[PDB]
Every structure is written in structure tokens, then in C-alpha cells.
């Protein structure tokens, strides 16, 4: 294999805790032959198959391999990969900005300029999963970071390759997973998947960073579900007032059922909310503003 | 009609029994009565975008099915409390832990002794599903033995907060429930009914009698395409000393078709469970199952 089967903390000094999930714990770490600082991932190991927790190898050695190849400035990077008899810890890339919604909701004001541009940094991450052919599969608010939140404007990274897979042609892929509120009609109709479903979320998260706002949030996860497959949605002039009506073009393009028709990564680089053709959309989405009262009330 | 008041004024708390993602169980004892029961703490979710706690309406919900339930297979529900942050649930206290878990340590076992047990799961089943309520989450650890130190302990099902009450002519559909006993409506996202109770008993069966699981892959993925194309089998090394009635009782359960797979009463009248002569006892009565995988499974 490739894990390194050595006590990773002969090697590196444990910090405090970054964050938690599910069967991994994230904390700060120091490389001791050089001083360098990472995020290490403790990944537990599942233990036998009919367990709940945990994770079983086979997917833990799919998320490093798909991190080895991955390489660009919006996605965190691999260091290295230790292992004991418990858990599988992966050396990440420490990023040190908190997520980028708190860094918004910490906003005075805010354009769809200014917007778009957060936006562009995630389909430029986005896109370049998606030229190796990899699928996210996760993207959500709390999955995209921020390097350094301490400069003007700040570095997108995301995070969180637990639920990435290559897609291959030919090889349907179906699984359940993903937050509700997130999730393509795809992947609650248990139908095949592939590089459209991250295309949807990036959709519903555009459509909150506008508004405050979440699409197809229900009273109740049923509800949010039934709201997903039948893409029951509107732009509440509550809270969409001020929203361009080239940003409502793009996710509407976006939040679409078929996979066929749904925007490509490519398509939604050059939409032109996002890649204006001309100085008239440039001037509009400069005068647009952003519901920073709803989303500040939404995310605190 | 829940009692807005401090649970701790009429009771007292005693020591943790268990817990989840968003309860846990507490010994307790009511003082005007001096009497013990399961207090389980449900944390209210706080907003509707929130991932923590469960919806208040959905706990209104729970409450609702249980009040209307009584059977001696089935949790009793003695009172709601209901603070800032939680609603209590006050139960039947159920003091001989899971099924499984005792299973796992008897000596010997028969497939009469078997049925037995299964009998008491279809009887509270039944119970429920007469009352249009399907229970949603039957599963291993949701079977609990009321003593434990008997001959023949008695079954107890709890844990409610996935049961719903289905309404004639009102489409339900929702995600939910561990993968390994969800049945193909489940994972496919389909119409949901008293079907799924069903096949979860089948998976139930199933495991009970070869300490194997029918669909359970590598993988949740593998788990979830061994449902949604039914394909299992009795491999010879588990199901060796297994009847062909408890087979044919499996296998009228684990079927796609909610139409095709067995009711709860046809359960009940499966020859497997109710035999219809001497001789159908006597089989079943000298077919023993291996507890053996069933313990390297569940220890
Ligand atoms: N490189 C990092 N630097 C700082 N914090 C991180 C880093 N990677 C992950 N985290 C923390 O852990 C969370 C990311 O999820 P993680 O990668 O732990 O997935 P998981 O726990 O294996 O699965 P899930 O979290 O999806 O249930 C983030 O919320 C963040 O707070
Ligand atoms: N009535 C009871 N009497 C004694 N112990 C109980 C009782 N109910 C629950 N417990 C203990 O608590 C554990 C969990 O109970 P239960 O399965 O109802 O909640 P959960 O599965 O943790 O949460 P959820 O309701 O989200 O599934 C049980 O395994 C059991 O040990
Ligand atoms: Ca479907």
C-alpha cells in the first residue's frame, strides 16, 4: 500500500482541535523535521462490516487516492498518511480561515461583484475536480474554507473528500449520502450519478449566498426532500428584491432535474454573471447587492 | 399536552441506560409512586436548516402513536415532560437489554424457540399495523427483552421516532433507517407503507437463524444495490441446518413488490410460525440453528 505504519506523533506534534465529524476528528499538527504546520485527520476505522462506525478501508484508500491527484489552489492538498491499529490519519493542508459563510455573515456590505468572484473560486476548484473526472459529492457551506481570513479578500479551499468518487463511463454509480438541504433530485431518487449532481449544489449554495435563503428547505426532511424532487423552489421578492436577474439566470440553470440539462462546470464558468461579455453586466452586478441582513439572521 | 414542568420535581434521575444522536436514556424512579422507569431525553432541534436535535412537530408526532399503544410487545408510554432544550419522554422501563445480545450467549437454540421470539415481534407488529402504524426503524437493537433472567424472556419494541401512521389515499415517501434492514421502497425513494415493516422482519429472520446478513455488502453502496436488486441467498455454510419453512417464510418476505410480500397476518399464518399439523412441529422442533457465526457476528 502506500500508508505510512509508523505513530504519527513521533513525527509530529498533536494541537488542538480544528473540527469533528462523523468517524473523523481534525486537529492542528507540527511536522517536527521542519517545523511545518497541517491539519491532521483521524479517520476511525470501521471495525466490522454490519457496523455504523467508522469507516471501512477500501473507501478510506479511495478518498487518499483521489487526494494525491488533486493539485490547485481552491482545493486543501495531501501531505501524508499515517496508520495505526484504530485509525488512519491523513496529513492535510491546515486551513486557517474558518468557513467562508462566517466570514460574510461577519460582513458590513457586499456586492454580487464581490460575490461572484467567491463563487468563481469555487468552480475554478470545482472544474478541475471535474476535468480529472472526480465527483465531490459533498459540497456545502461548511465544506468551503478559507485560507487565511485575515487578508481583504480571501483564498477559497474546499474541504471534506469523503464522499469523492472518479466517475467512470459506462460504470453507473449509485449510493445515498449528502445533507438534505444539498442534495441533487438525482441522489434522493436513487438514480444514477455523476458530475451534474455538484453542479446542483453549487446551485442551491449560490442561492443562499444571495438571499439568506435555502431553496428546497422544508419544516421537515421529508418535506425538504419532496421539495427537492419536485424542484419546488421561487425567488421570495422578500428576499430576492435586489438579486440581478442574471444571477437568478444562473441558478436557474442550475437547480434543474434532468442532469442533461443541467449547466456543466465549463458552462457555468462562462455564464455571464460570472463572466460578463460586456461593461453593461459588469455595471449591473456591480449595483447589485447582497441580502446580508437575511443571511447574517440565517447563519448566527 | 405536554406537562411544562421540571421532570426532576417528580422524579428522580438515576443512571444512564443508553443514548443515541439525539436522546438519551435515564433510570428513573417517580416519587409519589416510588416507581422506575426509562426516561429518554429527546433535544428539540432549534432550526429548521440545524442538523441537531429533532423537530418539535415530529416529537408531537411520536407521542401521538404512542399514546395510542398498548400490547404486551410493545413499549408502554406513562408520560411527556417537556423543558427549554428537551422533551422527556417518560417509558416502560425495559430492564433485560437486546434480544440479540441474549441470544448471543444462550447455549442451544431451536428453530421452535426461534419462532417463538418471532412470534412475539409479529404479534406487537400486528398490533401496530392494525392501527395503520408502521414502525419504520424494526432492527436488532430496537428489540429489547422486558426480564432476561427467565425461561422465556418477553419482547418489548421501542424506539418510535421513525414510526408514522399511514393514511389512505396520503402518499408518504422519506428517507431514513439503517441500510442493512431498509427495505427496496426505502432506497429507491417509493411509496412507503406497512410493507417495509415487512421486509425488515424477513431481514430480521434471516439473520437470527445464520448469524449472516442477506444484503449486507463491503460497502453501504454494495448494501444498497444487493436491496434494490433483491439478491441474497442461503449459502449452504450458515444454512445448513436451516428448515425449508423458515426459508419459504424468508423468502415470501424479502420481496420487491410491496403488493406481492407478505401482510403482517400472513405472516402470522405462515405455516413457519403457526403449524398446521404434528408433523410441520416435529421439523421444526428438531431443527436446530447454529449459533456459532451468530455470536462471531454479534460479540
Ligand atoms: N484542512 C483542514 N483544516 C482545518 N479544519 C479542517 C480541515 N479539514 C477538515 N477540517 C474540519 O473538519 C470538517 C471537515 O470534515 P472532515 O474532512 O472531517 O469529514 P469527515 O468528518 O470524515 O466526514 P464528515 O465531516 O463529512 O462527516 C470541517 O468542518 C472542518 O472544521
Ligand atoms: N425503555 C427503556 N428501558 C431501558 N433502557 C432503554 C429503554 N429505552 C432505551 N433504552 C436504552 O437506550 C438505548 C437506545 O434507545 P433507543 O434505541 O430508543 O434510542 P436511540 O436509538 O439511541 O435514539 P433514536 O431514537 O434516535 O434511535 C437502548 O439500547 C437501551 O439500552
Ligand atoms: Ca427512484
Redesign the interface.
Known amino acids: 500500500e502506500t500508508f505510512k505504519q509508523q505513530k504519527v506523533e513521533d513525527f509530529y506534534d498533536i494541537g488542538e482541535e480544528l473540527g469533528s465529524g462523523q468517524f473523523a476528528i481534525v486537529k492542528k499538527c507540527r511536522e517536527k523535521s521542519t517545523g511545518l504546520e497541517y491539519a491532521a485527520k483521524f479517520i476511525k476505522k470501521r471495525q466490522?462490516?454490519?457496523s455504523?462506525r467508522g469507516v471501512?478501508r477500501?473507501?478510506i484508500e479511495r478518498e487518499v487516492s483521489i487526494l494525491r491527484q488533486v493539485l490547485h489552489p481552491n482545493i486543501i492538498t495531501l501531505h501524508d498518511v499515517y496508520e495505526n491499529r484504530t485509525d488512519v490519519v491523513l496529513i492535510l493542508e491546515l486551513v486557517s480561515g474558518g468557513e467562508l459563510f462566517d466570514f460574510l455573515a461577519q460582513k458590513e456590505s457586499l456586492s454580487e461583484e464581490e460575490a461572484t468572484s467567491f463563487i468563481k473560486q469555487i468552480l475554478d476548484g470545482v472544474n478541475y475536480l471535474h476535468t480529472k473526472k472526480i465527483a465531490h459529492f459533498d459540497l456545502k457551506p461548511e465544506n468551503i474554507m478559507l485560507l487565511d481570513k485575515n487578508i481583504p479578500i480571501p483564498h477559497i479551499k474546499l474541504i471534506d473528500f469523503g464522499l469523492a468518487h472518479e466517475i467512470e463511463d459506462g460504470v453507473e454509480?449509485?449510493?445515498?449520502?449528502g445533507?438534505?438541504?444539498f442534495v441533487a433530485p438525482e441522489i434522493?431518487?436513487?438514480e444514477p450519478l455523476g458530475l451534474e449532481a455538484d453542479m446542483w449544489s453549487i446551485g442551491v449554495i449560490t442561492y443562499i449566498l444571495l438571499s439568506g435563503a435555502?431553496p428546497f428547505?422544508?419544516?421537515?426532511?421529508?418535506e425538504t426532500?419532496?421539495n427537492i424532487?419536485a424542484v419546488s423552489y421561487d425567488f421570495d421578492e422578500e428576499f430576492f428584491s435586489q438579486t440581478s436577474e442574471l444571477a437568478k439566470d444562473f441558478i436557474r440553470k442550475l437547480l434543474v432535474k434532468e442532469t442533461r440539462k443541467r449547466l456543466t462546470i465549463q458552462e457555468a464558468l462562462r455564464h455571464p454573471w460570472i463572466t460578463p461579455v460586456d461593461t453593461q453586466q459588469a455595471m449591473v452586478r456591480r449595483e447589485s447587492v447582497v441580502n446580508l441582513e437575511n443571511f447574517k439572521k440565517?447563519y448566527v
Open positions: 466490522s462490516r454490519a455504523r471501512c477500501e473507501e454509480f449509485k449510493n445515498i449520502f445533507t438534505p438541504e434522493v431518487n436513487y435555502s428547505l422544508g419544516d421537515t426532511k421529508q426532500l419532496a424532487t440565517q
